[PDB]
Amino acid sequence: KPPKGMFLSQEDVEAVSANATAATTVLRQLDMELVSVKRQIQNIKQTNSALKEKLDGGIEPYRLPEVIQKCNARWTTEEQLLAVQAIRKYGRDFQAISDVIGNKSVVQVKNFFVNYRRRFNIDEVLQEWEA
Amino acid sequence: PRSFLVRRR
Amino acid sequence: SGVEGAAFQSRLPHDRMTSQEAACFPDIISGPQQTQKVFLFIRNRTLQLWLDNPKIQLTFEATLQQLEAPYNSDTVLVHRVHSYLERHGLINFGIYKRIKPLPTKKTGKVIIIGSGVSGLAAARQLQSFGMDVTLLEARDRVGGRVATFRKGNYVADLGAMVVTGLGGNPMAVVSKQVNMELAKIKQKCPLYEANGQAVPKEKDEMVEQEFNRLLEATSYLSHQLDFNVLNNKPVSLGQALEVVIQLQEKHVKDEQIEHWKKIVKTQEELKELLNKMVNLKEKIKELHQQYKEASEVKPPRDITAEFLVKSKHRDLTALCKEYDELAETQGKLEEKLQELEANPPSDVYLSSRDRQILDWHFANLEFANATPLSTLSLKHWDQDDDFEFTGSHLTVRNGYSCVPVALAEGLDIKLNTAVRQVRYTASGCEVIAVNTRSTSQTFIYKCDAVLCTLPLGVLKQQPPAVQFVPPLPEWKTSAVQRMGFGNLNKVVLCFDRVFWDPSVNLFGHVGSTTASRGELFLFWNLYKAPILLALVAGEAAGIMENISDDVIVGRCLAILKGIFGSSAVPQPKETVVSRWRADPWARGSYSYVAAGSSGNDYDLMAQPITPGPSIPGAPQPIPRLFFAGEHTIRNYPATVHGALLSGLREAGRIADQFLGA
Numbered sequence: 001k002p003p004k005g006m007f008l009s010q011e012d013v014e015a016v017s018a019n020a021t022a023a024t025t026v027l028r029q030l031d032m033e034l035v036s037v038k039r040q041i042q043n044i045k046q047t048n049s050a051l052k053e054k055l056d057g058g059i060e061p062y063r064l065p066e067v068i069q070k071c072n073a074r075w076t077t078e079e080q081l082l083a084v085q086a087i088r089k090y091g092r093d094f095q096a097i098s099d100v101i102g103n104k105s106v107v108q109v110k111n112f113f114v115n116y117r118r119r120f121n122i123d124e125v126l127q128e129w130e131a
Numbered sequence: 132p133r134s135f136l137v138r139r140r
Numbered sequence: 141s142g143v144e145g146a147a148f149q150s151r152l153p154h155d156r157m158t159s160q161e162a163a164c165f166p167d168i169i170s171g172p173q174q175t176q177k178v179f180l181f182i183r184n185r186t187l188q189l190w191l192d193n194p195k196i197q198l199t200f201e202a203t204l205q206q207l208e209a210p211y212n213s214d215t216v217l218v219h220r221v222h223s224y225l226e227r228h229g230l231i232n233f234g235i236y237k238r239i240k241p242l243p244t245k246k247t248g249k250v251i252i253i254g255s256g257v258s259g260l261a262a263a264r265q266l267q268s269f270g271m272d273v274t275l276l277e278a279r280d281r282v283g284g285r286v287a288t289f290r291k292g293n294y295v296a297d298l299g300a301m302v303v304t305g306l307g308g309n310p311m312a313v314v315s316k317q318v319n320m321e322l323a324k325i326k327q328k329c330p331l332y333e334a335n336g337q338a339v340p341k342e343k344d345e346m347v348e349q350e351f352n353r354l355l356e357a358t359s360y361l362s363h364q365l366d367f368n369v370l371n372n373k374p375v376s377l378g379q380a381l382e383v384v385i386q387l388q389e390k391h392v393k394d395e396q397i398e399h400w401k402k403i404v405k406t407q408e409e410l411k412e413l414l415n416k417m418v419n420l421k422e423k424i425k426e427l428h429q430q431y432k433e434a435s436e437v438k439p440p441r442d443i444t445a446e447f448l449v450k451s452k453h454r455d456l457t458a459l460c461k462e463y464d465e466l467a468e469t470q471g472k473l474e475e476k477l478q479e480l481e482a483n484p485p486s487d488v489y490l491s492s493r494d495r496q497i498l499d500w501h502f503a504n505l506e507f508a509n510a511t512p513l514s515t516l517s518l519k520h521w522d523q524d525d526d527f528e529f530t531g532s533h534l535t536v537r538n539g540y541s542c543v544p545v546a547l548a549e550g551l552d553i554k555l556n557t558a559v560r561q562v563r564y565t566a567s568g569c570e571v572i573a574v575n576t577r578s579t580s581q582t583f584i585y586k587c588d589a590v591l592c593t594l595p596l597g598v599l600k601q602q603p604p605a606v607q608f609v610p611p612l613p614e615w616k617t618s619a620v621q622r623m624g625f626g627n628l629n630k631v632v633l634c635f636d637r638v639f640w641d642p643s644v645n646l647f648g649h650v651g652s653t654t655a656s657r658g659e660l661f662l663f664w665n666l667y668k669a670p671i672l673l674a675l676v677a678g679e680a681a682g683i684m685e686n687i688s689d690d691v692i693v694g695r696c697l698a699i700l701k702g703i704f705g706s707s708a709v710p711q712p713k714e715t716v717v718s719r720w721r722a723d724p725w726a727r728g729s730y731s732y733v734a735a736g737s738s739g740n741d742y743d744l745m746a747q748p749i750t751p752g753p754s755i756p757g758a759p760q761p762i763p764r765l766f767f768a769g770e771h772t773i774r775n776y777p778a779t780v781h782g783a784l785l786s787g788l789r790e791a792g793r794i795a796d797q798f799l800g801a
């Protein structure tokens with residue numbers, strides 16, 4: 001039952017009493033430890049200040065305008081060819097392939113993978129992507 | 132002893 | 141209740157028989173519960189009667205009259221109870237108009253060394269029992285460590301000053317018997333730092349709360365963690381306080397470290413994120429140029445050239461999504477990092493001013509125990525706490541000397557008579573004293589018993605001021621060596637006008653350093669006349685005794701001038717400075733529980749000495765040498781009530797021996 005806010009452990013008491021100068025020793029070990037952490041803060045916050053300087057402007061110049069094309073159910077020969085190339089570059093990732101074409105849902109792409117597998121040798125295309 | 136302490140609380 | 145309150149005022153439990161009672165009434169306490177309640181009521185009632193009017197002797201007859209059945213049924217029981225109470229000084233103690241005058245025929249002869257309160261209390265009881273009593277006193281006055289300064293209307297106690305509550309205090313009885321002007325002390329005590337500026341209220345409360353927390357901590361350190369020995373030596377209260385303070389200073393540092401240690405962790409997360417964001421900005425920059433070059437190729441174009449524009453477009457929006465998610469994560473880490481810089485933990489445990497104000501609270505504790513905290517036993521310094529009286533602390537306006545002088549009336553007191561040697565044998569004792577004025581005028585007093593009320597300081601004196609023949613046994617001398625005898629001095633400042641606040645009874649002064657924390661740390665105003673009383677406590681007491689009264693009065697005026705201003709503080713009319721450690725009839729102020737001592741040593745001091753037989757193979761002699769005084773009473777040490785009670789105790793022990801129980 002120690003007093004609230006007073007800190008007194010068997011371990012801490014023994015460590016202060018162990019020697020005649022162990023008390024003064026323990027307090028400087030922490031004082032030195034504190035200086036070594038404060039200098040490491042000043043180092044990393046100056047390193048972090050340099051990285052912030054390099055990001056000045058963000059990615060606003062390299063930002064591309066948003067395009068929202070109305071998803072269509074019919075596949076043009078153009079769209080079919082974009083897909084086969086997207087399959088070759090991105091493999092089995094269906095979301096990337098949908099983004100490339102621009103007007104085909106992930107389900108339609110998933111359907112396409114089965115429908116045209118025979119005619120567009122999709123199995124061969126996947127093997128080439130894996131290599 | 133303790134009893135003689137001033138401002139006892 | 142009235143009967144229950146009488147037991148409380150007599151420091152007895154109202155509903156239970158004590159150890160003392162068990163010894164004198166073994167038949168009753170070993171017997172049925174009903175007889176015990178009858179006994180307890182008779183005792184409680186007899187006490188009530190005495191307490192309701194302690195100015196006149198309460199006889200056995202008077203007691204029996206005012207009792208009622210079935211309690212007044214048994215007359216021998218009522219007589220045994222009244223007799224016990226009278227013998228042990230619980231009734232008919234102090235100054236009472238005697239009903240039946242004392243018999244001219246006296247039984248037994250007792251010499252009492254010292255005319256202090258312990259001596260005077262015992263002497264009255266013994267004379268009251270019809271023994272021949274003579275007190276030997278080295279001083280030209282009675283009262284001993286109760287000393288009152290007097291010049292005109294100026295009146296100030298250099299010794300005992302305070303009645304530490306009337307609730308259970310036998311001085312309550314003495315105050316109804318003697319005209320003492322008991323005036324309550326007002327607890328309000330403002331501090332004033334080295335400069336003369338009152339400690340700000342908010343801060344004063346903070347340091348006081350920390351002092352009490354620090355004490356509470358030393359108790360925890362003692363009783364719970366069993367931190368009571370260190371390198372064979374017993375642990376001082378001062379050592380424990382040092383250890384507790386150091387652990388509080390450690391925690392403050394430990395706390396800072398953990399706070400700065402979680403800032404670097406946040407900065408090292410930010411560093412690892414910013415690096416990821418810089419590398420991603422480069423990949424975005426490169427991939428934008430690639431998209432531009434692909435889009436530069438104007439339509440119409442084959443599907444591979446179209447795919448290159450589309451694939452790079454989707455690849456660039458993907459990387460621009462990541463960077464925006466990383467820019468989100470960056471923003472919340474920068475907020476967390478600003479919150480840690482906003483709420484730093486405590487800088488220091490206590491400032492230089494805080495440590496000075498805390499040193500005043502330690503000075504107060506060094507005053508109370510009349511010794512440096514480095515001497516006090518951690519475990520046992522407060523061993524008498526359970527027996528402390530209830531009610532407001534009081535002062536004597538008349539001066540405390542009014543009490544012993546009252547007790548001294550009708551007693552054979554030889555003043556200017558310094559005991560040099562105490563001889564005790566199977567046949568009796570002889571005490572060898574001298575005249576203090578002409579030290580060659582030698583006196584021999586023959587007695588059946590000697591009562592020693594010599595202060596612990598005098599008993600400690602090496603080489604001895606008083607020789608015991610034969611020498612006191614090792615168990616007595618070891619107790620004397622072990623036990624602490626402290627020091628505490630008073631500076632009396634008499635003025636023509638009050639420049640202080642009359643509503644405030646006492647005000648502190650904070651010392652510059654730790655070393656000087658006791659030096660004039662507190663001022664008392666408790667009298668009608670314009671008198672201020674400055675206390676010299678702790679390590680300061682011993683050192684300030686080797687300094688002239690002028691210099692001491694100087695340092696007092698300086699400190700007072702700083703608080704009330706140079707114009708308001710005149711030169712004092714009369715100045716007095718106590719030097720109790722140098723006083724050869726005291727050799728200090730009062731007992732303290734020294735490191736390596738305990739309450740058990742106070743009991744050893746009270747134990748009487750039995751001499752060996754004169755002729756070998758002769759029966760075990762009776763005890764001849766008895767001891768009283770504040771150092772002999774374990775439950776009320778270092779007090780006037782303690783002295784008083786120790787006297788009453790020894791009177792009963794001596795009467796029981798030489799007149800029979």
Ligand SMILES: Cc1cc2nc3c(=O)[nH]c(=O)nc-3n(C[C@H](O)[C@H](O)[C@H](O)COP(=O)(O)OP(=O)(O)OC[C@H]3O[C@@H](n4cnc5c(N)ncnc54)[C@H](O)[C@@H]3O)c2cc1C
Nearest residue numbers: 254256258278284285300301302559725729769770779780
């Ligand atoms: C500064 C100070 C403040 C105090 N304040 C308080 C207080 O506020 N409240 C409180 O309750 N108590 C207080 N006390 C304690 C109180 O004064 C004592 O506890 C009490 O007076 C002790 O009485 P005593 O009979 O045991 O010893 P003493 O009063 O010392 O009596 C012993 C007697 O022996 C005499 N003597 C010594 N050597 C010889 C010798 N060789 N031959 C013959 N006679 C000798 C002495 O002169 C003295 O008269 C204070 C003490 C001091 C010093």
